[PDB]
Each structure stands twice: as structure tokens, then as C-alpha cells.
Design a binder for this molecule. Structure first.
Ligand SMILES: O=C(O)C1=C[C@H](O)[C@@H](O)[C@H]([C@H](O)[C@H](O)CO)O1
Ligand code: NA
Length: 386
């Protein structure tokens, strides 16, 4: 019942980390290339302590399709824990080739400090729904089951602590079931199990990595009733836990299992969700073991961000937690949407959270920004709503 962390001085700090085209000092690459919006965050701490923050750089609009590059920023040092804006390097690029979509960043750090980054790709003239108008007036084809028209699964990696990345290798034929059209990896993060394997959540399946760190053999674990956008964590009992976005507004969809297979997905009545991505973090395994969860705690709105703790060996129930609005950021738009968490080297939780200026309401011209937050467990536990 007791948590020693509650007695620690609570700590929080927050500031925009990916600054959209409308903001002062917008984030652009060294080449001069800029971005309307940043969406779809992912963050990991490497074995050195450096933090790598990834996002989709959406070139022209906030839309999911069209010219989108995979961007990132690193902490300048391995020891600064991204505490302040001057602790972060300028925007860099993992991959941006072509006018198609490079996205769904889903990283995982392997034992040797190889950072794997799983990505989704689609072509310049395709979108999920089809018939969408691109900036130049071209009308999209619906994503389909052809090589040119399907969603691809790519893999890139860094061997130098995120400083450089390989040209992404296409693993669609290997790790995406044949005849598929739409696909998604993550987005958010994969995990490394106590038992040594990697697990990357994807649509309808987990991607499993076995063998030597940074030189893994990959295989597909097919799942029944999973979502398109999944999260994975190892719970304190050592079991696996999928917590997926629901197909329709309502609740998070949870299933538990092992590398030998999963049980059925069922909605967690304790975790409302507006049909949006969420994130999950394995915090610690010694008493009191903790799992962290972040999403929008609402059946209707993405503007209800709430970080929570579970002390259950199977993460059966999460506490009420704390609303991120208790520590709001100013001048970055309306916070809420997709999220990603890591642990920092100075015993904080680091979270990336989407934010929306809403200047064009629900429309394509609404600038999207990404917030970086740090808070400790004490901050979570001393919230007004626990
Ligand atoms: O902000 C969203 O709702 C969203 C953003 C991503 O860029 C899309 O790949 C994703 C996808 O449309 C759903 O998972 C349904 O397949 O949705
Ligand atoms: Na591009």
C-alpha cells in the first residue's frame, strides 16, 4: 500500500521539444527543410544515458499521409537527462527520402546499445482512406495490397548512440503477413525482456527479436483480436501485456500472455480512451514494483492526458494518477494526443506528448507540436485526485 516515492520532493518540468512552423524558433533540419507539424512521438533512453526523441516531421500539413520524414533530437550529452531546452541538440533526420510517408517510430535499445528503429512507410500518392487531396491537387489512391500501394515495415539502426542511422531496410515480406494493405508498427516503443528477447508491438502481431544483441533474428507472433496501434510491457510477474488502442472510442483493449501466446483482448473499464495511441513503461521490479501508463483518460477527447501507476503483478488496475494539465505548458497549443515514456538517468519519467494549436479546428492546417515533460513518481502520487 505504501510508496516511499510519495515522500520524495515532487518534481516536474515541461517545455516544447518539437516546435511547429507557426512557433518562434520552429524546428528545421540543417538542410533548411522545415515542417508544418510534428506528430507521433517516441522516446528511449540508451545504455549510455543519452535520450533519443523521435517524431514524424509532417512537411506540409498535419495529415497522416503525404511527404512525412522521420525526425529526431538527442540530448547533447549522456548525462544531462534533457532537463532544459539547451540540453537538447538541434533537429536531425533518420530518413526522409521521397515524397511518401516515413513514420510510426517504434524504437528499442538492445543490450549492446544498438538502437533499433522500426518504421512504417507508404508511397507519395496513397493514403489509408484514399481520395484525399494532396497540397498540389493530386488525389490519393487508397492504400491497397500491391507492393507500391501497401504499408511497408522498415528497419533502421544506430551503432553510435543515435548519432547516425543506416538506410532503412525493408522487412515487409519477412515481418508483415502477405496480402496485407494497411499496417502499423507501434507507434511508441519496443521492450527488452528480463529473459533477453525483444518485443516490438505492431498491428495484429508482435515482432520478436532473438539471439545476439544488435544482431537479432526476427519472427512474427500473430495475435487474435489485437489493435492496429499496440503497446507492450513486461509486467512484474514476468508476463507480457498488450494494451492497444480500441477500434472505436471507449476503453483500452488489454491482453496478457507470453512468447508462447496470448489470451483474448478485453476492454479495461478502468482505462477510458478516445480511440487514440497511448504509452506504457516498466518502471522497476523490486518492492513496490511499478508499471506506468499514459493516455487520454476520456471516451471522447484527446485533451485528458493522465499518467498512472499500477502496483499489480499483472497490471490489472492502475491508480487514478495525475492529469498532465496540473503542470500545463504555455504557448505550445492544446496538449493531448499520442505519447511516449522513458525513464531518465536522474530518476524521473520523461514523456513526449502531442499538442494541437487548433487554429484550423479539426482541419489540415492546425499546427501540431510535441511537448517534453519530466516528472518523478512523487509528482504523480501527490496529485489532487488520488
Ligand atoms: O491520430 C490518429 O488517429 C492517427 C495517426 C496516425 O498517423 C495513423 O496511422 C493512425 C491510424 O489512422 C489509426 O491507427 C487507424 O488505423 O491514426
Ligand atoms: Na520526404
Amino acid at each position: 500500500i505504501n510508496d516511499p516515492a510519495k515522500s520524495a520532493a515532487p518534481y516536474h518540468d515541461e517545455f516544447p521539444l518539437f516546435r511547429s512552423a507557426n512557433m518562434a524558433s520552429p524546428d528545421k533540419l540543417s538542410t533548411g527543410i522545415g515542417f508544418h507539424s510534428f506528430r507521433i512521438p517516441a522516446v528511449v533512453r540508451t545504455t549510455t544515458g543519452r535520450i533519443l526523441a523521435f517524431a514524424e516531421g509532417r512537411r506540409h500539413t498535419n495529415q497522416d499521409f503525404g511527404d512525412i520524414n522521420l525526425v529526431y533530437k538527442r540530448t547533447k550529452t549522456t548525462a544531462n537527462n534533457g532537463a532544459s531546452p539547451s540540453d537538447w541538440e538541434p533537429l536531425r533526420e533518420v530518413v526522409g527520402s521521397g515524397a511518401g510517408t516515413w513514420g510510426n517510430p517504434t524504437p528499442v535499445v538492445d543490450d549492446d546499445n544498438t538502437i533499433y528503429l522500426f518504421l512504417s512507410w507508404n508511397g507519395a500518392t496513397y493514403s489509408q482512406n484514399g481520395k484525399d487531396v494532396l497540397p498540389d491537387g493530386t488525389v490519393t489512391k487508397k492504400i491497397d495490397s500491391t507492393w507500391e500501394g501497401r504499408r511497408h515495415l522498415y528497419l533502421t539502426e544506430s551503432r553510435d548512440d543515435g548519432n547516425t542511422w543506416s538506410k532503412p531496410v525493408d522487412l515487409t515480406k519477412e515481418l508483415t503477413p502477405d496480402g496485407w494493405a494497411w499496417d502499423a508498427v507501434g507507434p511508441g516503443n519496443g521492450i527488452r525482456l528480463t529473459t533477453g528477447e525483444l518485443v516490438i508491438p505492431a498491428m495484429g502481431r508482435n515482432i520478436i527479436g532473438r539471439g545476439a544483441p544488435g544482431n537479432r533474428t526476427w519472427s512474427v507472433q500473430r495475435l487474435s483480436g489485437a489493435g492496429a496501434e499496440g503497446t507492450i510491457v513486461q509486467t512484474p510477474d514476468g508476463k507480457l501485456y498488450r494494451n492497444d488502442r480500441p477500434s472505436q472510442k471507449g476503453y483500452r483493449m488489454v491482453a496478457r500472455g507470453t512468447l508462447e501466446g496470448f489470451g483474448a483482448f478485453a476492454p479495461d473499464a478502468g482505462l477510458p480512451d478516445p480511440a487514440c495511441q497511448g504509452s506504457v513503461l516498466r518502471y522497476n521490479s523490486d518492492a513496490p514494483a511499478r508499471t506506468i501508463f499514459l493516455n487520454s483518460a476520456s471516451g471522447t477527447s484527446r485533451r485528458a492526458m493522465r499518467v498512472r501507476i499500477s502496483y499489480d503483478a499483472d497490471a490489472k488496475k492502475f491508480n487514478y494518477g495525475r492529469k498532465l494539465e496540473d503542470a500545463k505548458v504555455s504557448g505550445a497549443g492544446h496538449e493531448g494526443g499520442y505519447s511516449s515514456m522513458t525513464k531518465t538517468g536522474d530518476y524521473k519519467i520523461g514523456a513526449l506528448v502531442e499538442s494541437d494549436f487548433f487554429n484550423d479546428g479539426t482541419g489540415k492546417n492546425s499546427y501540431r507540436a510535441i511537448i517534453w515533460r519530466r516528472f518523478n513518481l512523487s509528482w504523480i502520487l501527490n496529485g489532487p485526485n488520488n
